[PDB]
Amino acid sequence: MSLKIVFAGTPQFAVPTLRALIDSSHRVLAVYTQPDESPVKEIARQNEIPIIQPFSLRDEVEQEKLIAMNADVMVVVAYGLILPKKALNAFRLGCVNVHASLLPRWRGAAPIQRAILAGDRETGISIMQMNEGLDTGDVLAKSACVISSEDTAADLHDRLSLIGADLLLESLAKLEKGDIKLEKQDEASATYASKIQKQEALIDWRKSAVEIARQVRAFNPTPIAFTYFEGQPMRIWRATVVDEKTDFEPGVLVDADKKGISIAAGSGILRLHQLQLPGKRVCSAGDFINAHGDKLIPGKTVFG
Ligand SMILES: [K+]
Structure with missing residues (x-):
């Protein structure tokens, strides 16, 4: 041929x-x-x-x-x-x-x-x-x-x-x-x-943890899903779903551990594993806790 x-x-x-x-x-x-x-x-x-x-x-x-x-x-x-x-x-x-x-x-x-x-x-x-x-x-x-x-x-x-x-x-x-x-x-x-x-990359914490997790996956490597933390944008590079019920409002911190930053969504929990603050390298959940742990208050903190 x-x-x-x-x-x-x-x-x-x-x-x-x-x-x-x-x-x-x-x-x-x-x-x-x-x-x-x-x-x-x-x-x-x-x-x-x-x-x-x-x-x-x-x-x-x-x-x-x-x-x-x-x-x-x-x-x-x-x-x-x-x-x-x-x-x-x-x-x-x-x-x-x-x-x-x-x-x-x-x-x-x-x-x-x-x-x-x-x-x-x-x-x-x-x-x-x-x-x-x-x-x-x-x-x-x-x-x-x-x-x-x-x-x-x-x-x-x-x-x-x-x-x-x-x-x-x-x-x-x-x-x-x-x-x-x-x-x-x-x-x-x-x-x-x-x-x-860009606005589509913003995390809406009212959505199911399942939906948000898809957003986080879909948008790696571009443009990277993001939310807000302490007034600043926070890009979420890696996350997983935890199918557990919470009494907490969407965006509210459930727990912060090396295993992940667990946040209440509209249903279930999203766990952050790799994240990024402005002008900083991407960091693990553990690294983040070491640097900013004093600002992580379960039931109070609030993302987005
Ligand atoms: K050829």
């Missing part, structure tokens, strides 16, 4: 897919990446692939340089530039994307965070035929994976990055054989995974 491919991508999520193309018999003619370096640029250089870094793909020059490549297909993974209509019609197999959700669920920029935040028990990868809309293209293939209550967005990101590489490669093979079954997106099931707004 062997296809001629232009690859476009920037952050670490894209690397495994690029590496899979590099390790295959397909020919990666060029790699497009953010101007300066990205993880993608590094792997391109290590493998003798020409590196193109336009600031914009609407510019006449850059647009025609791309369409003039004579690739069979363009593969796009986490690329920051919008692809112009001509770019999309440039190659016979079009532009194919590796999207980190099970479309039509979680179209948009933050599908990993949003899936975890919602308590989805599974998510996955969709290989998508790109068009001029936002993640509305036909789905060439899907592969699902479980989300565990242990997973942060970082963990899920890494898992999906590998699944995406394998699926993309398998899909390009079926795509050149003409063995792929298109799945048009069911608009009724479509949901949008927009970027996490």
Whole structure:
């Protein structure tokens, strides 16, 4: 077989897919990446692939340089530039994307965070035929994976990055054989995974400990969930749920121990394990107690 491919991508999520193309018999003619370096640029250089870094793909020059490549297909993974209509019609197999959700669920920029935040028990990868809309293209293939209550967005990101590489490669093979079954997106099931707004990262202590814990997981490593302590913002990096009833109001301190800073939520208890005060390194519950223990009064203190 062997296809001629232009690859476009920037952050670490894209690397495994690029590496899979590099390790295959397909020919990666060029790699497009953010101007300066990205993880993608590094792997391109290590493998003798020409590196193109336009600031914009609407510019006449850059647009025609791309369409003039004579690739069979363009593969796009986490690329920051919008692809112009001509770019999309440039190659016979079009532009194919590796999207980190099970479309039509979680179209948009933050599908990993949003899936975890919602308590989805599974998510996955969709290989998508790109068009001029936002993640509305036909789905060439899907592969699902479980989300565990242990997973942060970082963990899920890494898992999906590998699944995406394998699926993309398998899909390009079926795509050149003409063995792929298109799945048009069911608009009724479509949901949008927009970027996490800062206010969304604020912990609402009235919510269930279970809901807050999902927020803490979803938002690690960005933007990190946060609450307030002694008038100052406090980022919560690691937490766990304790399914025990309290008489205390939401946000009220239950107990402070090396095992965690236990806080009453609207139901159950959230236990803080790793946290961060302004301009300070992230610290354990034990460290925090050593520094600020005199301000930790069970039944009185109050977070948020
Ligand atoms: K190759």
